[PDB]
Design a binder for this molecule. Structure first.
Ligand SMILES: Nc1ncnc2c1ncn2[C@@H]1O[C@H](COP(=O)(O)OP(=O)(O)OP(=O)(O)O)[C@@H](O)[C@H]1O
Ligand SMILES: [Mg+2]
Ligand SMILES: [Mg+2]
Ligand SMILES: [Mg+2]
Ligand SMILES: [Mg+2]
Ligand SMILES: [Mg+2]
Ligand SMILES: [Mg+2]
Ligand SMILES: [Mg+2]
Ligand SMILES: [Mg+2]
Ligand SMILES: [Mg+2]
Ligand SMILES: [Mg+2]
Lengths: 79, 98, 112, 151, 127, 100, 206, 79
RNA sequence: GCGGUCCGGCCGGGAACUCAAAGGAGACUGCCAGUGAUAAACUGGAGGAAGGUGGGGAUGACGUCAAGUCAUCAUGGCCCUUACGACCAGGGCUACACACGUGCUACAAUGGCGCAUACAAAGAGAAGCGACCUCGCGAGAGCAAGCGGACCUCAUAAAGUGCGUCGUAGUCCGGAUUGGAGUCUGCAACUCGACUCCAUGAAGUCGGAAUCGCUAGUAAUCGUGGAUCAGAAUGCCACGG
């Protein structure tokens, strides 16, 4: 569904995560990279992701590692 | 030896070019293979003729590519000298093998 | 007759498909691995071979384990807060089909 | 129709039996353009009727046909804003056609076994004045008698 | 010493040789039963020379290309008809009266843009 | 057709020809069974750092005369409307009215 | 809109083509673009030259443009200098060597493109539309023509509501495929919008 | 309960008592939705047929069968 | 046809045949009889492959609906012109109590599923079609010829037939919907791709009033191709059984 080899992540979002574990837990990371998957070294972070109009924050949990950030940010609001 | 293939969009025009080419090979006197009409091609295009929504109203056009073969087999140096640079066919492409 | 539940009256290949978790090819693989003829029925099988069938089925997640496994999957997605989980909660299609006119299976029988 | 008199298509004779009468029957039982299936069913069903009747192959088909082919029929023939069906005679060509259609339709009913048997049963009942086809010919014959006033 | 006809029907073409010997047929280097006896389409192939009392005077070499089962059967039957002019045309009237001389020009219609298949209009609605 | 959009097509074609025509080692070479000792990883990341106009996907292939995105025909390079306009006055060589 | 294009329907029957070259798919699109640039530049340049037909043939990796005109000297300019300053600009727009030839038509009132062009110039010259079309029809008929139809559509004379007016003299069978029917279109950009002019000139039955 | 197309079928049914025989080589199938008027003289076997269908009697020539959807409700000649 | 055999047009070879080309002949009520106003024409017949515009396509009169398109374009007026113009990322056009139009797959035995095997036409291909072979249960992945093509590839056609089984059950019908595992293309498949494998097995047992298409290679059914297209047809456009 993604590829045989080489899981995908945007470079800018990878760099912000490495800077996070270097500087520890910090303020939420505001990113628009709804396509980049989750790595284990993002767990414990409260990164915020775009939903088209606002950055909805998502607190990364152990389970959410095989998914993508946009999977936890709905786009269209209904009722 | 050398085989000449001619493509064109007009059969009244290609038959002239292929007859002129076979004649020039025959200007050596004899021993030419004769023209061979390989099967043509009919590309077809269907386009909507309206600038807006009328899907059932459309025209269909086709481009017919007529194609002949010569296949000169006589290794006459006079033939190749008078073949290249002297056929002078316009509107019709020439391939000629070796 | 065993295999957790009861397979009845059918050819061993297709009777075994009654196991929640065994379909056409898994049942073919089981009968191949048990050395049982495909064309024979469940009433012609010896008790000295059904025990092998139990052994063969044991190498697969089946009714009790499978239905728990599926329930864990859907609940983990529902509790996850992801889009697939949200679609599971609200009952809407998850694979990304139309909801404008279709999706009567997931939505259920029509109601105004 | 409105203008002309249309031509015929002359049909092709039945392979096994040299009669075009059975060829038209195969064409009627035909569905979806599958003629090989249609002839296969007719041949098998007519063969397993030969064991049930005694007549060879074709006599046992006609004596079934002659029982379910009607003679008169009612058609809507209003005049003054009317709503009553005038009983009219059936031309000989349509008599065979109406017979074959009724047999095949009845055979597609009476679901008992594969199509080979369903056809086989119906012709045997037609050969003895009993089936749903021969019942249908009686229904139209009875509907024309009830309307015999209009002529 | 062979006599030939082509025969055509429904996008299929045939070649038939009527060389005179004992009665037998070969189609694409095999007989009808193995090649064409399928679907029992042998009646039409047999039909022309059966009417002309085929018996033991014709051995047939048959080739065919294109078209389906029935289309090839019509081509061979038409080919045999055109083939059986070596016994001079004294039988031409006796063979044409039953047909087999018409080429049967009828064939598939083009798709007819705007429709489904050449006559099948899509479903209509006033509203 | 919104000249800005025609400029976008030229900019993408300019960039698509600049990198991907010669440079193809990331998408092609690196994605084989080669050793992936973080070198496949970096070439994966290297693709992100490249400009977004990666040759095949980003272009629209619209009509040359009007810039119409829909109804394009590759044989002529025009949309359906400009093909018929040019065909009817004999611009396109060989394009007969056609029927069968 | 219900009429087929008179030129297009006869392209392989009686009328010729305007481009006569062979190209595969690789360069079929690129050629068509180049001829469009050549024709568009030629027409806008030789507007005062009364150009009727521009036919382009591409022989032997070269482009040749034949410019059918009613005033050859105005295209040649001065013993050839206008030709050379077109052959360069044409070849500099195609990227390949270009040969420019011209063909005089000694019947400018019998050519549909010239006639339609003439009527549009008068419309921009504020000539009454009835006068222009009647003059065009009479000129072609007396000059020798089996028939001619002139149709002008738009806001004729500044009328707030448009109306199509056409005038036909003689025979002009739009359905006879062997008929030598010469048809062309033009537009007039008046101050009231566009006024479109169509001209049919029937000359012979085969 | 909903009834499938296969309801009841008897094949070559035959029953006798002592030396008098009531049913001899009877075969018939009952299509669904049908009402079957069983008529005949007294003691001809009308009630014994119901006995066989309900399974309280065993025919000599067997072959009485019901579809698996069939549920039988029987009303006796005697109260 | 001729003897040749690695039995396959492979092979020298031959223009006889299918073909695929161009150029030709052919069908015009031409001939006969009858009807008809000594007519136009009609009804039959011979001959022919074809018979009365042979089949069907292009072909759409003056005009109508001030019908449809200022979002293909062109264009008169208005308008915005540090924004109604321009660039970027993300989102949306894919939503979902419902309603309608057009379709595809079915509700089975004229069938499903296994094994064996026959017969097409048309078309497309160069940052493309991609043999063979190897590895994958598969989508395919690696290596890699050939082909700008009557040569190579896409490309084993499927309904058919032969055998066996299933025996009228919501089933060995139906193949939805969900859960895992994945392949590809693409910078990237979460919103929101296609495809494969394992598991699941939902409605549906032929459809109310009403309503649609079709007159012959037509309806019905079966498969194939192409355009658009990096990927994405149950639509469209074509082809044949
Ligand atoms: N066990 C038995 N031994 C001998 N004869 C028997 C036995 N049971 C029934 N019979 C006879 O066999 C016949 C079967 O009759 P049954 O009771 O089946 O009904 P019927 O006669 O068909 O109908 P009805 O009840 O309406 O009179 C009768 O003549 C009956 O007397
Ligand atoms: Mg005749
Ligand atoms: Mg078809
Ligand atoms: Mg613009
Ligand atoms: Mg694209
Ligand atoms: Mg039109
Ligand atoms: Mg006649
Ligand atoms: Mg954007
Ligand atoms: Mg199934
Ligand atoms: Mg499955
Ligand atoms: Mg109904």
């Amino acid at each position: 569904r993604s590829l045989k080899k080489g899981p995908f992540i945007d470079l800018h979002l990878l760099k912000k995560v490495e800077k996070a574990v270097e500087s520890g837990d910090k303020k939420p990371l505001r990113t628009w990279s709804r396509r980049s998957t989750i790595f284990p070294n993002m767990i414990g972070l409260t990164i915020a992701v775009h939903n088209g109009r606002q950055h909805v924050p998502v607190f990364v949990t152990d389970e959410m590692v095989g998914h993508k950030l946009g999977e936890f940010a709905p786009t269209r609001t209904y009722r | 030896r050398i085989r000449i293939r001619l493509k064109a969009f007009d059969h009244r025009l290609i038959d002239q070019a292929t007859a002129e080419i076979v004649e020039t090979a025959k200007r050596t006197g004899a021993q030419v293979r004769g023209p061979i009409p390989l099967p043509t091609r009919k590309e077809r295009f269907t386009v909507l003729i309206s600038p807006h929504v009328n899907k059932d109203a459309r025209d269909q056009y086709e481009i017919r590519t007529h194609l002949r073969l010569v296949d000169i087999v006589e290794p006459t140096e006079k033939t190749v000298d008078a073949l290249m640079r002297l056929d002078l066919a316009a509107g019709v492409d020439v391939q000629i093998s070796l | 007759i065993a295999g957790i539940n009861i397979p009845d009256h059918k050819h061993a290949v297709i009777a075994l498909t009654s196991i929640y978790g065994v379909g056409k090819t898994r049942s073919k693989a089981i009968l191949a691995a048990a050395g049982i003829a495909e064309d024979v029925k469940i009433s012609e099988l010896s008790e000295g071979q059904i025990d092998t069938l139990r052994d063969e089925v044991a190498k697969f997640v089946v009714e009790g384990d499978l239905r728990r496994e599926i329930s864990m999957s859907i609940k983990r997605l529902m509790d996850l807060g992801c889009y697939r989980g949200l679609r599971h909660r609200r009952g809407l299609p998850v694979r990304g089909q139309r909801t404008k006119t279709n999706a009567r299976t997931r939505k259920g029988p029509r109601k105004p | 129709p409105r203008r002309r008199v249309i031509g015929q298509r002359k049909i092709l004779p039945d392979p096994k039996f040299g009669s075009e009468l059975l060829a038209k029957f195969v064409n009627i039982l035909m569905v979806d353009g599958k003629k090989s299936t249609a002839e296969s069913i007719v041949y098998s069903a007519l063969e397993t009727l030969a064991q049930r009747s005694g007549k060879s192959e074709l006599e046992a088909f006609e004596v079934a046909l002659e029982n379910v082919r009607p003679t008169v029929e009612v058609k809507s023939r209003r005049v003054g804003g009317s709503t009553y069906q005038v009983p009219v005679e059936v031309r000989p060509v349509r008599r065979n056609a109406l017979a074959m259609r009724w047999i095949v339709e009845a055979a597609r009913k009476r679901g008992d076994k594969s199509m080979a048997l369903r056809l086989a049963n119906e012709l045997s009942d037609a050969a003895e004045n009993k089936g749903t086809a021969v019942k249908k010919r009686e229904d139209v014959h009875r509907m024309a008698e009830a309307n015999k006033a209009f002529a | 010493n062979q006599y030939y006809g082509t025969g055509r029907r429904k996008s299929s073409a045939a070649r038939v040789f009527i060389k005179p010997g004992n009665g037998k047929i070969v189609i694409n280097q095999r007989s009808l039963e193995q090649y064409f006896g399928r679907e029992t389409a042998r009646m039409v192939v047999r039909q022309p020379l059966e009417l002309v009392d085929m018996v033991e005077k014709l051995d047939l070499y048959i080739t065919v290309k294109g078209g389906g089962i029935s289309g090839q059967a019509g081509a061979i039957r038409h080919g045999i008809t055109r083939a059986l002019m070596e016994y001079d045309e004294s039988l031409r009237s006796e063979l044409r009266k039953a047909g087999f001389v018409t080429r049967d020009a009828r064939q598939v219609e083009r798709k007819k843009v705007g429709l489904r298949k050449a006559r099948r209009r899509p479903q209509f609605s006033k509203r | 057709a919104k000249q800005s959009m025609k400029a976008r097509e030229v900019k993408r074609v300019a960039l698509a020809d600049k990198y991907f025509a010669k440079r193809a080692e990331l998408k092609a070479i690196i994605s084989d069974v080669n050793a992936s000792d973080e070198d496949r990883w970096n070439a994966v990341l290297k693709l992100q750092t490249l400009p977004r106009d990666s040759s095949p996907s980003r272009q629209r292939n619209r009509c040359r005369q009007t810039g119409r995105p829909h109804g394009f025909l590759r044989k002529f390079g025009l949309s359906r409307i400009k093909v018929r306009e040019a065909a009817m006055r004999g611009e396109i060589p060989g394009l007969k009215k056609a029927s069968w | 809109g219900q009429k087929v294009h008179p030129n297009g329907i006869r392209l392989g029957i009686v009328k010729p083509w305007n481009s006569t070259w062979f190209a595969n798919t690789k360069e079929f699109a690129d050629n068509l673009d180049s001829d469009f640039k050549v024709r568009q530049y030629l027409t806008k340049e030789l507007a005062k030259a009364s150009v009727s037909r521009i036919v382009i043939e591409r022989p032997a990796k070269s482009i040749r443009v034949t410019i059918h005109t009613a005033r050859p000297g105005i295209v040649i300019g001065k013993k050839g200098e206008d030709v050379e300053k077109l052959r360069k600009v044409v070849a500099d727009i195609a990227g390949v060597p270009a040969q420019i030839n011209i063909a005089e038509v000694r019947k400018p009132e019998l050519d549909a493109k010239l006639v339609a062009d003439s009527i549009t110039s008068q419309l921009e010259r504020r000539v009454m539309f009835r006068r222009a079309m009647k003059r065009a029809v009479q000129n072609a008929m007396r000059l020798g023509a089996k028939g001619i139809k002139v149709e002008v559509s738009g806001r004729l004379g500044g009328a707030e509501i448009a109306r199509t007016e056409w005038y036909r003299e003689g025979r002009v069978p739009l359905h006879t495929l062997r008929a030598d029917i010469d048809y062309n279109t033009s537009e007039a950009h008046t101050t009231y919008g566009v006024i479109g002019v169509k001209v049919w000139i029937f000359k012979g039955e085969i | 309960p909903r009834l499938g197309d296969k309801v009841l079928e008897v094949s070559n049914l035959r029953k006798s008592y002592g030396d008098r025989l009531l049913i001899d080589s009877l075969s018939f199938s009952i299509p669904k939705g049908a009402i079957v008027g069983i008529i005949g003289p007294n003691g001809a076997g009308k009630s014994t047929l119901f006995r066989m269908i309900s399974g309280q009697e065993q025919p000599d020539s067997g072959t009485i069968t019901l579809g698996e959807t069939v549920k039988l409700a029987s009303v006796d000649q005697f109260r």
